[PDB]
């Protein structure tokens, strides 16, 4: 009776893509997936699901198939499928004006352009919806984004990345744990 929550990782389909950057949002929900014993499982909406309970509560993880660009046509659908609200989302994504190692947590935003964000934004009519949003560094310029987010972590950045990976679970948990969002922004900000 408590709802549920949908966490929503963004990313590109494929092994062309799983570990380039843009994909940070798929780690980081394949991360908690692993957390709690969950499988993704392939669903009617274009997606990945893996599902787990907390206290009573299905938290859902989900990892749309449908390219970055395209990712609402996975997100809105789910919501009407499962009956979930734009305050039940906690959409995770890769930030191209944070460094490496940072995460932010913010509830509302157009994420400079991001095309995922976008999409969402575009399917649910609004740009109102709980994200963390995970560094992975600023490029040099307009010219170097796509190559910048369409390539791996450095082999030094690594350990970077895993940590705010980490705090990325840990955000996770103490919203599923009933914590306030607004609370978990004063936490992990
Ligand atoms: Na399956
Ligand atoms: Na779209």
């Given at each position: 009776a408590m709802g549920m929550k949908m966490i929503v990782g963004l990313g590109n389909p494929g092994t062309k893509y799983q570990?380039?950057?843009?994909?940070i949002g798929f780690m980081v929900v394949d991360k908690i997936a692993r957390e709690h014993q969950a499988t993704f499982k392939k669903n009617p909406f274009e997606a990945e699901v893996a599902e787990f309970f907390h206290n009573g509560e299905k938290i859902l993880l989900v990892k749309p198939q449908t390219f970055m660009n395209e990712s609402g046509r996975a997100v809105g659908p789910l919501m009407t499928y499962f009956g979930?609200?734009?305050?039940e989302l906690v959409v995770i994504y890769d930030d191209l004006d944070l460094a490496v190692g940072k995460i932010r947590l913010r509830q509302k935003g157009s994420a400079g352009g991001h095309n995922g964000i976008k999409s969402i934004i575009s399917h649910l009519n609004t740009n109102v919806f709980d994200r963390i949003k995970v560094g992975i560094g600023r490029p040099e310029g307009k010219k170097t984004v796509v190559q910048h987010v369409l390539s791996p972590f450095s082999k030094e950045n690594q350990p970077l990345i895993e940590e705010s990976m980490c705090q990325s679970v840990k955000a996770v948990e103490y919203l599923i744990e009933g914590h306030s969002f607004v609370d978990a922004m004063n936490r992990f900000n």
């Open positions: 570990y380039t950057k843009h994909n979930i609200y734009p305050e």
